[PDB]
């Protein structure tokens, strides 16, 4: 008596960026069963023999690219059980990714499937023997009793001891802080300060590498050609030019370099000196010597983002915000339109009382009263009572938020910045009217005024640029980086460390952690570390990352729910008669309006799966890993923050519910919305500059002649430098390019990731949800009422929260994950 097997695995170099099937023929991959309903002495499952792949099968037609099969047979006799696990044994020196192990039975209802999609070494690497288990699901307390053991084992082998250099093969996952940004070995003014394990500096922490201390600094990590992630993060892919993580590294390392030596030559001109010039970068392309564009081209990722004729032009793509009227952007009403559906949409907060006020202390900053006043404002013929009142009036503030980091910024030689406030009046026909910019520094502080006539043009012109360098290093530090990447680290590795693979809430949430440790540790490395492409291009430079260690400060999980986010930024307000439970008191606020949808369709998901596990209130006490995962995540990975009164306690199901829908609502949903608009925005930096490089001229300077007689080069003399401005282009190109192996929300990467039918009709029910939703968006955006807000004067639907989308640079679509 037998038991047939497929295994289904993926040889090594389909997934890099020489192999032999016969190799793995013979005695060189064994696999064991292992019983989960008849036990040994010790109450472990009973084990059986070592069984070696018997042949290539290609007579199988739901293979996929780059798999293999291999027909196995199984000796199991009667005192053996059925199967619920096995362990595998790879004696090559090569190692392999393995996909999936099907045992056939006499009925289709008997099949047993193993989702593996797990990397598997040689077994002198391993400590303890590689175990998989079928794919039937099971809170701790239902667990076959001779699996128990193995269940826990297992988790032991993935947290480790808290000790030890990590190496490629390892699967271990553990905590550290964010020590390894600064680079002090190479030169003291690379020295950053360690973030997490403070008050003074609190972060997120990140996933422990192990390498050691540097020689000058026993605080800080030393470098590494390679940050180590566990194995299975590490995510190969069929083509190499969808390893777009791996271009941010070529990027930092290569290609910036080549870029620098051709403004080092004097080999084109170091300044834009017209707008055209910037608009020449997607047109005709930008010339560049030999030699440099032979440096570039040749490199995988790197070579898909630009057009080039091989000798020296390398163009960029036209950006959507370009693609219908080039001058769009300069308006007012693209200005306001983009704080409610641009890049960063979720930082516009309604007014209730006037003037605005800080809440930094004036010991050491002043008089922080707003300069503004009240009539001094356009209000369309609203008095500002009335405004207030009907709840018209809202505000831009990034006063107390970049105050405390001026004077450091503006001593730094490169950078010149203010701390800004916009003020925006809610019009009758719906839309957004900036009406007042003040701009502050700590220690002239400045109120302007909209003009389109006149030098003053130009003075409100610069006025919002310095908004959008605050805004764009907000949005990329805090909105981007800190609320998605840094603050969802913490969660994956707590899901891995104790949520067993058979657990249902792993199953629920690992697919929405696809990819992101791996993006994080290129980032370290490469993005956000020290002499870094963040550093390098955006306004703070030096003092980027710490920046946002102030802002987490403040953060607060339960606030990053949507309902619960619009709320406390007062545009919505709490009204149970909608369907949603919150009235926008923007209505046509299209981040917000699509994001409601989405939100309430993983509510469903999220309510209609957990009850099918947890039946009572108790079940939730009384799980045992989800206690330790829930324990260790705040008070480890979040644990600068372990003290505040707003964690929930997971005592009850809708706790459990509430956790589950805001981790996925920030790592599909959140991530797109601020993230895939980067390149599509900012693409043109004129209309998202990054850092600015002088204040405003007084009058009486050439400069502020210049500005009367060229308001273009004015302009572009404030924001972001060409060098840095092709460098940061690339960036945020990448980063707004969807993968050909992206797994979009509403979509898995294997079908039969649980043998439970009711999961599995749940999850088509959320599929079919979100295509509903898709259609229900295409008619917004075609609806001439909304045209104000939606599209705008740069005629761009907002599409950012369509849950599907093809590869590219797309500008929709939804992914499970953080995955770039
Ligand atoms: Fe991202």
Redesign the pocket.
């Known amino acids: 008596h037998k038991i047939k097997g497929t295994v289904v695995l993926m040889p090594k170099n389909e997934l890099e960026v020489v192999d032999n099937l016969n190799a793995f023929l013979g005695r060189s991959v064994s696999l064991q069963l292992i019983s989960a309903t008849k036990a040994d002495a010790h109450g472990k499952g009973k084990v059986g023999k070592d069984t070696f792949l018997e042949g290539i099968n290609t007579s199988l037609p739901t293979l996929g690219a780059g798999e293999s099969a291999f027909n196995i047979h199984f000796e199991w006799d009667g005192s053996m059980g059925i199967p619920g696990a096995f362990y595998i044994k790879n004696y090559m020196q090569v190692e392999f990714f393995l996909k999936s192990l099907t045992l056939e039975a006499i009925s289709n209802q008997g099949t047993i499937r193993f989702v593996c999609n797990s990397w598997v070494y040689n077994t002198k690497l391993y400590k303890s023997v590689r175990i998989f288990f079928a794919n039937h699901t099971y809170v701790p307390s239902e667990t076959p009793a001779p699996l128990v053991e193995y269940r826990e084992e297992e988790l032991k082998s993935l947290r480790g001891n808290g000790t030890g250099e990590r190496k490629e093969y390892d699967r271990i996952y553990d905590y550290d802080v964010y020590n390894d940004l600064g680079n002090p070995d190479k030169s003291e003014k690379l020295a950053r300060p360690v973030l997490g394990g403070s008050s003074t500096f609190p972060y997120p922490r990140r996933g422990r590498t192990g390498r050691g201390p540097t020689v000058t600094d026993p605080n800080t990590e030393k470098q590494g050609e390679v940050f180590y992630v566990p194995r299975d993060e590490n995510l190969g892919h069929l083509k190499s030019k969808d390893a777009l993580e791996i271009g941010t590294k070529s990027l930092s390392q290569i290609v910036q370099p080549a870029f620098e030596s051709a403004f080092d030559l004097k080999s084109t001109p170091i300044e834009f000196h017209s707008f055209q010039d910037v608009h020449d970068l997607y047109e005709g392309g930008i010339k560049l010597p030999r030699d440099v564009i032979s440096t570039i081209i040749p490199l995988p990722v790197i070579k898909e983002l630009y057009r080039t004729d091989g000798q020296h032009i390398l163009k960029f793509p036209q950006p959507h915000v370009v693609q219908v009227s080039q001058s769009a952007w300069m308006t007012d009403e693209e200005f306001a339109r983009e704080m409610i559906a641009g890049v960063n949409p979720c930082v516009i907060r309604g007014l209730e009382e006037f003037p605005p006020k800080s809440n930094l202390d004036p010991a050491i900053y002043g008089d922080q009263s707003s300069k503004i006043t009240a009539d001094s404002l356009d209000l369309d013929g609203y008095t500002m009572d009335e405004a207030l009142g009907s709840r018209r009036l809202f505000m831009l503030d990034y006063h107390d938020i970049f105050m405390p980091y001026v004077r450091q910024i503006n001593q730094l030689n490169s950078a010149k910045t203010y701390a800004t406030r916009t003020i925006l009046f809610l019009r009758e026909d719906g839309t957004l009217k900036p009406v007042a910019i003040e701009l502050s520094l700590p220690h002239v502080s400045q109120v302007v005024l909209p003009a389109k006539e006149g030098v003053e043009s130009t003075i409100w012109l610069l006025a919002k640029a310095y908004v959008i360098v605050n805004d764009s290093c907000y949005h990329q530090l805090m909105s ?1 980086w800190l609320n ?2 840094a603050a969802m680290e913490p969660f994956v590795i707590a899901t891995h460390r104790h949520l067993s693979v058979l657990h249902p809430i792993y199953k629920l949430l690992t697919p929405h952690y696809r990819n992101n440790m791996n ?1 994080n540790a290129l980032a370290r490395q490469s993005l956000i570390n020290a002499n870094g492409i963040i550093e390098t291009t955006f306004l703070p430079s030096k003092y980027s990352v710490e920046m946002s260690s102030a802002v987490y400060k403040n953060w607060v999980f339960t606030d990053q729910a949507l309902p619960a986010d619009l709320i406390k930024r007062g545009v919505a307000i709490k009204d149970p008669s909608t369907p949603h439970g919150v009235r926008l008191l923007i209505e046509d606020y299209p981040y917000a309006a699509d994001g409601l949808e989405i939100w309430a369709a993983i509510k469903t998901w999220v309510q209609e799966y957990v009850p099918l596990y947890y039946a009572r209130d108790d079940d939730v006490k009384n799980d045992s890993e989800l206690q330790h995962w829930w324990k260790e995540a705040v008070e480890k990975g979040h644990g600068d923050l372990k003290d505040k009164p707003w964690w929930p306690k997971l005592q009850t199901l809708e706790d459990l519910v509430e956790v589950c829908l805001i981790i996925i609502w920030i790592a599909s949903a959140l ?1 797109a919305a601020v ?1 895939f608009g980067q390149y599509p925005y900012g693409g043109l930096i004129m209309n998202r500059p990054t850092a600015s490089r002088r204040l405003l001229p007084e009058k009486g300077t050439p400069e502020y002649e210049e500005m009367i007689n060229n308001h273009e080069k004015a302009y572009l003399r404030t924001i972001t430098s060409k060098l840095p401005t092709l460098i940061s282009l690339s960036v945020i190109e990448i ?1 707004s390019t969807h993968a050909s192996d992206e797994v979009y929300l509403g979509q898995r990467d294997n079908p039969h990731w649980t043998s439970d039918s009711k999961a599995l009709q749940a999850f088509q029910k959320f599929g079919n949800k979100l295509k509903e939703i898709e259609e229900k968006l295409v008619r917004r955006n075609n609806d001439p009422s909304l045209q104000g807000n939606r599209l705008g004067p740069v005629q761009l639907p907002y599409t950012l929260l369509y849950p599907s989308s093809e590869e590219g640079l797309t500008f929709r679509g939804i992914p499970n994950s ?1 995955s ?1």
């Open positions: 981007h998605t990447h993006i991530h993230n980063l953080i770039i």
